[PDB]
Amino acid sequence: IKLFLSTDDNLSQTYDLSIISKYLLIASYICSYLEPRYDASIFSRKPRYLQPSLFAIERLLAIFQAIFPSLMKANIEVFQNLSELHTLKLIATTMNKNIDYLSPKVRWKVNVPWEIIKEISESVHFNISDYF
Amino acid sequence: KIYPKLHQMDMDKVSRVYADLRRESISTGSFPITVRHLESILRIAESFAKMRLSEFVSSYDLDRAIKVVVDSFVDAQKVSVRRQLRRSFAIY
Amino acid sequence: RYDEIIFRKLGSMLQTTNILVTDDQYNIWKKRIEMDLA
Amino acid sequence: TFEGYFDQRHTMSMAPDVTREEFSLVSNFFNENFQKRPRQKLFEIQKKMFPQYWFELTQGFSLLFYGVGSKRNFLEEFAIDYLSPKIAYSQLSIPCLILNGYNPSCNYRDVFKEITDLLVPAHVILQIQKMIDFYKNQPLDIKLILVVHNLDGPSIRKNTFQTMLSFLSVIRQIAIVASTDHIYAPLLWDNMKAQNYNFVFHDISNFEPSTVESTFQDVMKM
Asked: Where is the signal peptide (chain B)?
């Protein structure tokens, strides 16, 4: 019965990431699906099915700082994890030839679906579901 | 019959809570925390004492009063700020 | 002090590590104890 | 704070135009005259780290120099006057390779030609693999010193050039010193690249004007 209940055509903790990497991914998913209008409204003390939009590096860093549990700031480890995310095909770019991250015309977008980020947030105990 | 009286033994424990609430309400849409809300802590502490029929306001009554007022203030903020104020008032 | 600050900022091994008591502090302690010792 | 990011018809023709020749004069005068003695004193003090830099390089720790201000002259003085002669006179003349990342006209194949000539006895990664397999049996003696200014250089920024430089540091008989100016420079390198690079990070900010690097971009476009 168990052989028929599953197709088993599948090729087979789904993504081993550092805490910095997990929070970076959480912030990137917010950036790629939340309007720029609501950033100051939500994070400052003053949609599930569409394709993701682009975002700038500063928006990602600011949201990461706002959601990271006194400031975490940006060290070499943060950017190293961010580059690992790109190398792992978790974050996409707007370029295909002669990759140069420092070119001021390249934007970022999320390649990770909802079903994985849900479990990442569950493992982080961060309530994304209340931000939408 | 029961009319508990107050003592100034725990003036700091109330004053610092009032200052903390006012500081956290300085730049967020929240309750209009004023002196009238400070009086609520004292009156609800008196009500807690009047359950024991004690003639004096004790430290435990003030502790429960501060707990109730601070929890009521915190549970009304927005989601993004609620999880921060959860830890900002961990003392109480 | 200026030299110690720039050494600390530069991450140099020439800067002393504050695990042991400083020479000045221990010297003052020794002098203050010894002044009343005899 | 981060809240400073969330809480945020004139033209340049209204300003008096300055020619390139006029631009050069004031720049040179204020570079040479203003803040001369304190910056020179800071440089002289910073020279005290030469033994530590030498020891780190001999242990195999690559040096990345960063901070505000030009770093070409510092690296030139170090590599020419302290590093290369002392290695020769303590191992018993060491050739030094200087790469100008601030030049957009560079080519990685041209640099690899010099590297192969200076290192290989008589598809770049395929030859780098042969170099790695060869230098395993060689004694752990520094034979070539590599200086790469501006690891954030326009053509240098490209992933292929960074990959080529990363596989170089596997060989212990090669000394690598690099410098960067961009604030987001660590974004270029991932864990594999960081592992191969083996940089020890030193801030050497000196507020030194970038006279040489300013030649490759025209200020008149501003």
From this structure: none
Task: Point out the residue among C3, C6, C12 whose CB comes nearest to the CB of D52.
Answer: C12
> In chain A, whose CA is at the least distance from the CA of D183?
A102
Apex D158 CA angle, D155 and D164, nearest 5: 100
The overall longest dimension of chain D from CA atoms, in Å, is 69
Tokens of D100: 């100008």
Phi-psi group of D15: left, alpha or beta (phi > 0 → left; psi -120 to 50 → alpha; rest → beta): beta
Residue D146 three-state SS: strand
Instruction: Report which of D117, D124, D121, D153 is spatially closest to residue D134, judged by C-alpha positions.
Output: D121
Instruction: List beta partners, residue D149.
Output: D100
Distance from CA of A31 to the nearest CA of D (A): 13
Interface residue D202 vs chain C (CB under 8 A)? yes
C-beta pairs of A92-100 under 8 Å, 24+ apart in sequence:
A94/A54, A98/D158, A98/D159, A99/D158, A99/D159, A100/D157, A100/D158, A100/D159
Resolution (A): 3.7
Give B81's contacts in chain A (Cβ within 8 Å): 45
Q: Do chains A and C touch (3 or more CB pairs under 8 A)?
A: no
CA distance D205 to chain C (A): 10
Distance CA D29, CA A27 (A): 48
Q: Which residue has the tokens 């135009």?
A: D17
Indicate if the alpha-carbon torsion angle A112, A118, A123, A124 is positive or negative. positive
Q: What is the chain D residue with the closest CA to A76?
A: D186
